[PDB]
């Protein structure tokens, strides 16, 4: 889906997720989807929200995906004891802080942007709000 | 429903009460598009563009399209009274064309309120050169 095609190291630490975000301003497009909650998006959820909003605006006007999954989250299997190494790497997540703008859009009306980002925000685990550009 | 359009229609109505000595009571209650269609088809057929079936029939926009003249024609404002003006002749038979428009199968609510054209009696005056 959305994974880095090459990495230095296979399995990464868990790490905490504290502090406020960076990409708060809507840089590229005109209408952005700002995550007000705090959690981890995944490659599945990012591809699901992107194809939902592409169906929503009917492929007119540019989409921007801003956060990209590059932190692998591993899962030990079932019927496996707790020892014996860190488990195999299954899927990739992208850490989100409060304030991260996830998707941007231009070449669409404002109201169609509202409907599209509602339709794609209902497939993401973190609570998100709408935002527009400013100068 | 919009301020500057209301003011410019007031300006058009005072310019056209300057223009036409035939200001006429058209008093529809159930105003038919096909009576509008004959009233506009004959307007384009024997006029230019100046003639309409104009409804600016507001209770206090008639009273401020008034104050050019006919300053006792404010009580002809309310109670469903409409106004149509047209230039050539001293109350030409297009008055009776609009009257036949308000009388063709209609609900009998025309009543010719008067518009104070000759400063005469309230009745129907069809005294014309013809």
């Amino acid at each position: 889906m959305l994974q880095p095609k090459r990495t230095k190291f296979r399995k990464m630490h868990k790490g905490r997720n504290r502090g406020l975000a960076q990409g708060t301003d809507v840089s590229f497009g005109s209408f952005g989807l700002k995550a007000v909650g705090r959690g981890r998006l995944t490659a599945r959820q990012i591809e699901a929200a992107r194809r939902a909003m592409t169906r929503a605006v009917k492929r007119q006007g540019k989409i921007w995906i801003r956060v990209f999954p590059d932190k692998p989250i591993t899962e030990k299997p079932l019927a496996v004891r707790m020892g014996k190494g860190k488990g195999n790497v299954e899927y990739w997540v992208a850490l989100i802080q409060p304030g991260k703008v996830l998707y941007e859009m231009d070449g669409v009306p404002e109201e169609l942007a509202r409907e599209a980002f509602k339709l794609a925000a209902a497939k993401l685990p973190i609570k998100t709000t709408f935002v527009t550009k400013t100068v | 429903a919009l301020n500057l359009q209301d003011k410019q229609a007031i300006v058009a109505e005072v310019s056209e009460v300057a223009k036409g000595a035939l200001s006429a009571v058209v008093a529809d209650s159930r105003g038919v598009t096909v009576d509008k269609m004959t009233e506009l088809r004959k307007a384009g057929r024997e006029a230019g563009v100046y003639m309409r079936v104009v409804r600016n029939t507001l209770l206090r926009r008639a009273v401020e399209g008034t104050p050019f003249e006919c300053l006792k024609d404010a009580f002809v404002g309310p109670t469903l009274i409409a106004y149509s003006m047209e230039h050539p002749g001293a109350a030409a038979r297009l008055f009776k064309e609009f009257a036949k428009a308000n009388a063709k199968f209609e609900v009998k609510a025309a009543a010719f309120e008067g518009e104070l054209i000759p400063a005469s009696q309230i009745d129907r005056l069809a005294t014309l050169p013809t």
Partner: protein, 93 residues
């Protein structure tokens, strides 16, 4: 050409700034030129309604502070991280 009423803020830090943002008055600074910077604090209602319309980030502003008018220009604004709120405004004379 807007006229914003300011007030000279006494003490500055993390604490007094967070107390002002609790009491609905975000702080701001005015630098520029050879004169000293000045520590102003503003209401949040008026300046959010002003920065809605985009002439606020465009034209010459005017600050009524201590009675004396100051012509100034909006330079650099820190917004809230995840809200429609303002944190701080850099003003250049």
């Amino acid at each position: 050409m807007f006229t914003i009423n300011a007030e000279v803020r006494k003490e500055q830090g993390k604490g007094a700034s967070r107390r002002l943002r609790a009491a609905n008055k975000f702080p701001a600074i005015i630098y520029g030129g050879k004169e000293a910077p000045l520590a102003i604090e503003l209401d949040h209602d008026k300046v959010m309604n002003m920065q809605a319309k985009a002439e606020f980030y465009s034209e010459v502003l005017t600050i009524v502070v201590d009675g004396k008018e100051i012509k100034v220009k909006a330079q650099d604004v820190q917004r809230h991280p995840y809200k429609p709120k303002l944190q701080h405004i850099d003003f250049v004379r």
